[PDB]
Each structure stands twice: as C-alpha cells, then as structure tokens.
Amino acid sequence: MVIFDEHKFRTLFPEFADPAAYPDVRLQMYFDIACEFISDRDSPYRILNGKALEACLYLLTAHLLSLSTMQVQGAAGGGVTAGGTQGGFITSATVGEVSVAKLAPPAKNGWQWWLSGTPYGQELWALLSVKAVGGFYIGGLPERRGFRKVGGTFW
Amino acid sequence: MVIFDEHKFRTLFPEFADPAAYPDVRLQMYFDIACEFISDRDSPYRILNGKALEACLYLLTAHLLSLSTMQVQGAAGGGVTAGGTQGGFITSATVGEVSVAKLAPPAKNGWQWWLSGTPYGQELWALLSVKAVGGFYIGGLPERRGFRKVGGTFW
C-alpha cells in the first residue's frame, strides 16, 4: 500500500492547485481507482519500485482526473452533452487558419491507446515502456551449479 | 453478487448526479444488465477481484447509461428519430471552421469497438486490457515434484 498525500501531487501538477476546483476526496478516490490499474504493492524485487511506482500511480490519477474534469466541464451549451466526450489522441486539429498534424503513437493495444489520450497518461506510458526491458524468468533451478567448469568454477 | 448503491456511482460520475434525470431504478436496472457482460462473482483467485471488479462494473453501467441518455435525448427535431442514433468512436469531426481528427482505437472485435464507442467504455477496456496479461493454465498436476533435482530439491 502507498499513501496518497496532496502536497506532492499539487506541487507536481500545478494545474490541479485549486481545492475548490479539485477537492481532497476527489483526488483520494481517483488514487484508489488508479491503484486498481497499477498495483501499489511495493517490493524491492519489482521493476517498478519506490519512487518510480509512486510517480506512475500519481500520473495515472492525473490522467483520470483530467478525463473526469473534461467530462464535467464539457461543454456543449453550458453543460455536459449526452454520452459525454470521448478521449483519444488528437492526430490532427484545425482552428480557423491554423492547422496542426501530430504523429500517431504506436498504440497497438487498448490500454496504450487510452493512456495516449492525455499527456499524463503519455508520460506514464513512456515510463512503463522505458522500464519494460528484458523480462522475467520464473521457475528454473541452478542446474549449472552441480557441474564443474573452466578454472575450477562451481565444482 | 455485488450490491450496487447510488452514492458511489453518483460521486464517481458527477454528470449522473440528478435523481430526476437519472432515477435510482434506472441505475439498478443497468447494473443488473452489466452483471451479464461481467459476472459479479467475487473470488480471491480472479484477476478481476474486489475493487477492480466493482470499478469495471460501475464503468460499464456508465457506458450503458450514456447510450440510453443518447437515445432518449436524441435529438433530431425535439425527440427520438427513427432507428435511433448509433454509437461508435468518432474518428473525425468538423463543426464550422473547427476540425478534429483522432487516432482510431485498435478495436479488433465487436465488444472492443462497442466499448470504445464511449469514454466510460474506453476506461473499462483499458482496465480489462491492463489486467489481461499472461493468462491461465487449466489442468496439469505437479509432475516435477516426484523427480529429484539439483541441491536435493523435490526428491
């Protein structure tokens, strides 16, 4: 279990500074939700351990809070439209004479595509990918330790 | 079986806060419906266990409620049109001078496409995908425990 404070979160994300706009219990609830996506069981053998895991969790709560505040604000005609507003990465946008065309992320899976919707999720995905190297080897006993080798190693 | 309460759902989704707009019996009916898509049998050996499973069920209820409010509100000329309005992810939209083009989800299946149709279903799909890593293994017995190994292990 990892306890969620508000000082670190509010200094890390200055846009979520107003308590009136973002209550305490809202941030706490979204941290409890983010614990479901990423397990907060801290162990020293985990790839995500300590501050990396804490940053991953905080980024996910930022992602969820950004999506929720998008839902709440809307806006269609001063409120929430029917069915809400969907997320996802804006590949191309155009306002007036200005136009922007961004590169699409390599979202091969729904989890990655949902993460790419907001930049907090993009940073979380980047951290997960940069920590994802190699892998695990589960099972297997040291069979080689019973056979003698060069230079008298592991007789 | 998982008991559904109005309070957690309403604080989770502030858009569904008005009891007049979203009666209690409507939410309860959609919870009984969502129990079919995800079985609410809570077990400690399940990958969806406890709070993650409840969050998944609540997200699906929000999905179904969003489709229902899309249907009831409409609107074509002040009501519901013939054959209703279909869901699905808005890949590209254009209103006036404003244009938006979003990345398409990797929906390889009808269930995934229907989920990606709404933002609540998108979060549900992300949770299911992030919990769907590895897999199961049915059958099989500890055959190796009857054969001696290195270091006097499992003689």
Binding site: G146, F154 | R148, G151, G152
Partner: peptide, 25 residues
Amino acid sequence: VVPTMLQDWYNSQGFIGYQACAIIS
C-alpha cells in the same frame, strides 16, 4: 572442498524410515 550443491544433493539421501520402507515394499 566439496561444493554446497553437490554436498546437499548427496546429503539428501538419508534414511527414509522403517515405516516408509514397509509401505514402499
């Protein structure tokens, strides 16, 4: 010196017991 892995691999072959011998016979 004997290695630890070979040593306890050989040491694990202790006396099983008279009850075990009778039940295996």
